[PDB]
Amino acid sequence: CXFXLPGGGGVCXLXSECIX
Amino acid sequence: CXFXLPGGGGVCXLXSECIX
Amino acid sequence: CXFXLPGGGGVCXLXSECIX
Amino acid sequence: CXFXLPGGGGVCXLXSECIX
Amino acid sequence: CXFXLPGGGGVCXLXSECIX
Amino acid sequence: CXFXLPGGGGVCXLXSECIX
Numbered sequence: 001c002x003f004x005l006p007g008g009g010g011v012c013x014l015x016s017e018c019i020x
Numbered sequence: 021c022x023f024x025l026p027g028g029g030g031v032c033x034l035x036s037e038c039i040x
Numbered sequence: 041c042x043f044x045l046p047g048g049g050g051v052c053x054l055x056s057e058c059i060x
Numbered sequence: 061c062x063f064x065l066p067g068g069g070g071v072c073x074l075x076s077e078c079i080x
Numbered sequence: 081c082x083f084x085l086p087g088g089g090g091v092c093x094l095x096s097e098c099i100x
Numbered sequence: 101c102x103f104x105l106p107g108g109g110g111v112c113x114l115x116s117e118c119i120x
Contacts, residue, residue, distance in 0.1 A: 002097045003023070003083065004113025012112040013104030014059050018023045019051070023083060024053025032052040033044030035080055039084045042077045043063070043103075057102045062117040064093030065102065072092045076087030091119070099114050 006017035009016060024032045032038075044052045052058075061067055066077040074080075084092045092098075101107065108119040114120075 001095075002100060004111060004118075009042055011059065013023070013053065014115065016022055019025055019082055020022060023050060024058075027047075031044060031079065033073070033083070035081045039073055040082060042080055043073075044079050053103070059104050060102060062115075062120060063113070064091065070117040078084070093119050097110065098118075100109065 001017070004012045006012050006015065008016075012018075021027060022030075023036055026035055026037050028035060031033050041047065041057075046052055046055070046057055054060075061078075064072045065076075066072055066075060068075075068077075081087065081097060086092060086095065086097055101117075103114045106112055106115065114116075
């Protein structure tokens, strides 16, 4: 976090911070 | 959560986890 | 659309209007 | 648009360009 | 938070809960 | 686009495709 900067990196919107 | 999966279901973007 | 309500009613954030 | 800036003004995430 | 609601009346998408 | 994939690359949620 914050939104656009997912924990662990990678694509924002794809994975645990999003659906996952 | 995460983004696009509201904890109480229904409409994502709609309810506690969004505005609410 | 709008944001959160894809046309045809799929999950918001999952598919071409998002990543896809 | 873009995301955060609804085209007709007002509050991002609240109104026709979001749910509405 | 939640998504779209900084919590103090500010602009969603601008500050710590977004980039920051 | 879609949401999460800004044109030109770059961070999603920052610059013209978001606020900007």
